[PDB]
From a paper:
Macroautophagy/autophagy is a fundamental aspect of eukaryotic biology, and the autophagy-related protein ATG9A is part of the core machinery facilitating this process. In addition to ATG9A vertebrates encode ATG9B, a poorly characterized paralog expressed in a subset of tissues. Herein, we characterize the structure of human ATG9B revealing the conserved homotrimeric quaternary structure and explore the conformational dynamics of the protein. Consistent with the experimental structure and computational chemistry, we establish that ATG9B is a functional lipid scramblase.
Full-length ATG9B, N-terminally tagged with a triple FLAG epitope, was transiently overexpressed in Expi293 cells. The protein was extracted from membranes into detergent micelles and affinity purified using anti-FLAG resin. Further image processing with and without C3 symmetry imposed resulted in 3D reconstructions of ATG9B homotrimer at a global resolution of 4.2 Å (EMD-17789) and 4.6 Å (EMD-17790), respectively, while the local resolution in the core regions of the symmetry-imposed structure ranged between 3.2 and 3.8 Å. Although imposing C3 symmetry during refinement improved overall resolution, it introduced minor artifacts in the cryo-EM map that were absent when the volume was refined without symmetry. Most of the backbone and side chains of residues corresponding to ATG9B amino acid positions 191–674 were visible in the cryo-EM maps. By contrast, the N- and C-terminal regions were not, presumably due to conformational variability and/or intrinsic disorder. ATG9B forms a homotrimer with a pore at its center connected to perpendicular branches formed at the protomer interfaces. Each protomer has a lateral branch that connects to the central pore and the perpendicular branches. As reported for other ATG9 domain proteins, the ATG9B subunits share an extensive interaction interface within the homotrimer, with an approximately 2,494Å2 buried molecular surface area per subunit. The conformation of our consensus structure is in a transition state between the open (state A) and closed (state B) conformers reported for ATG9A.
Numbering used by the authors:
A (entry chain B), B (entry chain A), C (entry chain C): 191 to 244, 259 to 548, 552 to 579, 585 to 601, 607 to 674
């Protein structure tokens, strides 16, 4: 695959180390096996009877034979374990193939250009482009008679991103299910994006089988209805497969988010209260022919002014402030009485029960209440915002939508498995013809590179 | 009352919602009833004998009959409760009158100008003035043949603030009892302000009976001595009344400040260490014909440079910091020994007693010690302060006086009931003739509006 | 001593108060007596038997006679105590001499210039110079026929600092023992500075006996070998003395740093993680003829931009952050399991043992991991840095070396007693002729002032 070569030469530098990639892979596999074995051990070896005393943990550990009969007790866990083992095996094989390819890629990189591994981090990736250009000037490889230039190098790596950006600009990709009382909703979890990628670009059932070029069948105008019907049955079967596979990935996501959330639960909610970017922003804010690293730099430099503009010109709300004041005072009065009682015997056994709950109410109330130039912040934010999707109300709502809250995004990820087939069935199938029309009328064929969207030029 | 109409049309917008006013009032009444009932319940239903164990709280609750004899046991509590009920019902009746008036005020507002309740928050109150102007141009009401101008609208609402600002800039209002060693003290608690308001502007014994016009009796030059004698009698009887009523309001203030302080006691003293504005600043630093909202906005904008100037250019103190260093080292050494003893049995039962005290000493010592352009901060503060009451020492002392500490202000509020009659007797009575002369020679009469201080123009 | 007069007149103002100096000294004496008595009391009066219960502390205190035979039990403690008492007596006598001289100089200061003690903090020390100049104009003292100028006044106080700055600029003074794998090491603990001061400038064995003029013997070219041999035997005997005295000063430093560290141990490591200046910076960054207060002010203003430049342009570390991510994820998983086990009996007695360790590992992992214009910061730092000792790698390494870590400096101070004779033996003795030549060829004699280094002019 011609595109895969450039994609891998980019990914090697972007992962700044071959050993880094190897460690990433091996420790990802070790991760997955750690979660599976630790969950099955906690659910299949831990005996609550001895622990609850209703003592050294080694003594509390039941003998291995008892674990043998206890794991024999249920057959469903055996099927779960064998499925997990098969998944681990297939990912292991794919990863071995990937690292086997990448080592030879790095060997070719060293032979062609001879940059030592310790010097890779110092290179700003512009000299990589310059060295590749000089390689074409010296005729290292016969990659077309006309030497490759910057636009072609960018296109051969970013064709799929260009199509996805154009399709999102048209407005079809972001889910826009109508809210009952009024408003627009957005749903761009990793599950939906993966489904779109498997449906459109990569895979055996993809329209772009291999992604080299658009097949001639879709150029014909008359066969569009038959091709739309074929796509309809394809999306129906894909939705059926996703619905079949939903519960297992749901459980996996539940375990992973449980670990991630309880890691931060002990820590202060300040990190939990922070807000990062969302995938909708990473989709609607990507210029044509743009690498991921430049996008990351732009959002990194635009993070602070956007946050300042968000927290400076928030719309006022009197009723919320009044209610917060009354709740915080009542919580404070109850805490006053309770603490005065507590200070002067430790054997109450009932006060300490409500102490934590009342303190939690006080802490949420204190942070919920508000306390004591929007135009300049908006201007300096838009200086890096570049594109953009009561005027102040609309602007604040849009800025809030483009920059979601962390727990909101995690809840979106958690709810993705259940919503995986529903949106595919309800939002894509009825509007089938116009997407095929968009591919038909917005594709441009060029010599050498091949298929490029008209919106890229 | 002509002034009351404009005052209420201002207050409706400033409370940004009729439902907001209704909820605030009803929940303030619920506030007071909750405080009284909870205090009397804790004093007359809590049984320390069973709770101290010398267990579910519901079991600890004594039967209602026993509470009946216990509340019957003392007659003083009955008088306290009946007085509280009388105060509650009087305030209830006043509040019902206020909300009944305000509902028809809002109805008239809707009929005249037709702004829905949701759109009130969006209006910057300038369009309110413009619409009222257009109403005069369209002849909505026959409020004098000459249409009302902006200065007149401001004056009819702000006459009392103008008089109070003039009287404060004369130097009479802020009580300035001399310190024994030296210096000037300022006392402007809410109690003294309420006393001045009840004496001068609002009430049956006020000089301004109704606040419409100055009575012609005070214009005569020959009667000034008799009028001063009458004012002396009035201030004596007012001081007697306030001295009679002092203990009950003192107890109420004690309860309220107890709740407020213990609400923040568990939280970090960072909020307790915060600095807020004082009423003396809100009186001396207020221009003529000035609305409360613009003053609040100006002080909100000027808050931060004032704090920066206060912290940057603090006067040096060698002896203070050196003694602080000694105390912090001694506390640290004692903490060292005590912790080393503690880490290696939990049954010491005497170490934990000194634990908290020594920790508190360490925490106060560490925060009390000092650690590593004043002109620019002073300039940017004075650019917003507009007015202003070793040069650096004098400037810093004035900036500290105009911006008090939170606990200092709360202590002033708590000490107000005892200080209520003392200052009225010792500070106002001897210098009555000059106050009478100030009212005599600083009032200018104009057509339509009426009585205006010469310092307003 | 002519120089001592100006040195004391500077130190009086720099310590901003005679009473301050007197109390600081008497509290330093009480300081040392407190450490010695408290340490010997804890080691020779505390009975672990009764306290461990294997109760009021007063009951736990053994009788005085018991402490009598318990201190009689071992003989070396008596020698330690008598040596400490003699050391305290020596410092007490020296301190009495210093305060006796300082009262006399303060009396002369009042008689000649008449500034009250309260006004000393107000003067910026420039008026002190002006008043002294006026004193020579009026002929108060016959200090040479030619009136004293600013340069001469600065030299008579800063001759030793000038020589030390020249020596450090030559590169000899800071020890630069070579690392085994490679790199440069710096060691400028107070012990080495005291040794070089006692060997070069102040002391009976100093080359500058009294610090008034350089002896004529060192000017002769032919005697340099014999003088170098004398210096070599002197450094050998000095190293022998320091090696003999090493253990006691080591123990004293251990006790002092123990108290200092355990004072901050309970507090958050934010103060422990703070960055402070190092003596190497205070040595290489000092211009010729600069007083200590000017240097302190310069670094006070340059502290912040240097810190910003340090935290902004840190070199990337892929392997470090990847390992940190893996460790923090594993620690979080173990913390998850431990916490969910703990939430639902307090009689476990084994989980709580690893609770603190696992939490500490999680905290160090989260603190260690990295998270999301260097040229401007470097420029604004160099604007105040004036002098200066992959270009970015070299610049960051220099900025890191020039500004050490706090705990690193304390560890350097702790390790100084063991390294005290080793560097003096290994680094100074072989290079003796070159240092003798350095004094010989860069000493300039001037009328009145006397000896000034060639690099001062």
């Amino acid at each position: 695959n011609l595109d895969s070569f450039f994609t891998k030469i980019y990914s090697y530098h972007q992962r700044n180390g071959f050993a880094c990639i190897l460690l990433e892979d091996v420790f990802q596999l070790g991760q997955f096996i750690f979660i599976v074995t630790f969950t099955t051990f906690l659910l299949r070896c831990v005996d609550y009877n001895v622990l609850f005393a209703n003592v050294t943990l080694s003594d509390a550990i039941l003998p291995s034979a008892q674990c043998a009969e206890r794991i024999r007790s249920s057959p469903l866990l055996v099927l779960l374990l064998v499925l997990a083992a098969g998944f681990w095996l297939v990912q292991l094989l794919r990863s071995v193939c990937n690292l086997f390819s990448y080592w030879d890629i790095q060997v070719f990189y060293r032979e062609a250009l001879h940059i030592p591994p310790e010097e890779l981090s110092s290179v700003p990736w512009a000299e990589v482009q310059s060295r590749l250009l000089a390689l074409q000037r010296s005729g290292g490889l016969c990659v077309q008679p006309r030497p490759l230039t910057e636009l072609d190098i960018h296109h051969r790596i970013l064709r799929y991103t260009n199509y996805q950006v154009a399709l999102a600009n048209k407005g079809l990709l972001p889910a826009r299910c109508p809210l009952p009382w009024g408003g627009s909703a957005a749903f761009l979890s990793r599950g939906l994006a993966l489904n779109v990628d498997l449906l459109l670009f990569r895979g055996p059932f993809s329209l772009f089988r291999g992604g080299w070029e658009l097949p001639h069948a879709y150029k014909r105008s008359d066969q569009r209805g038959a091709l739309a019907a074929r796509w309809g049955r394809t999306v129906l079967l894909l939705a059926a497969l996703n619905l079949a596979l939903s519960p297992l990935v749901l459980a996996w996501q539940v375990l992973h988010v449980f670990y991630s959330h309880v890691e931060l639960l002990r820590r202060e909610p300040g990190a939990l209260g922070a807000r990062g970017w969302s995938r909708l922003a990473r989709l609607q804010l990507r210029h044509f022919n743009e690498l991921p690293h430049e996008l990351r730099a732009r959002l990194a430099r635009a993070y602070r002014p956007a946050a300042a503009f968000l927290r400076t010109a928030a719309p006022p709300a009197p009723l919320r402030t009044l209610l917060a004041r009354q709740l915080v005072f009542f919580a404070g009065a109850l805490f006053a009485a309770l603490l005065v009682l507590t200070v002067y015997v430790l054997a109450v056994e009932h006060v300490l029960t409500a102490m934590t709950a009342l303190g939690v109410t006080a802490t949420v109330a204190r942070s919920f209440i508000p306390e004591e130039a929007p135009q300049l912040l908006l201007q300096t934010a838009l200086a890096h915002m570049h594109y953009l999707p009561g005027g102040r109300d609309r602007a604040y709502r849009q800025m809030a939508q483009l920059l979601q809250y962390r727990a909101v995004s995690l809840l979106e990820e958690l709810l993705s498995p259940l919503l995986t087939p529903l949106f595919l069935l309800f939002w894509f199938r009825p509007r089938a013809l116009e997407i095929i029309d968009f591919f038909h009328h917005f594709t441009v064929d060029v010599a050498g590179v091949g298929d490029i969207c008209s919106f890229a030029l």
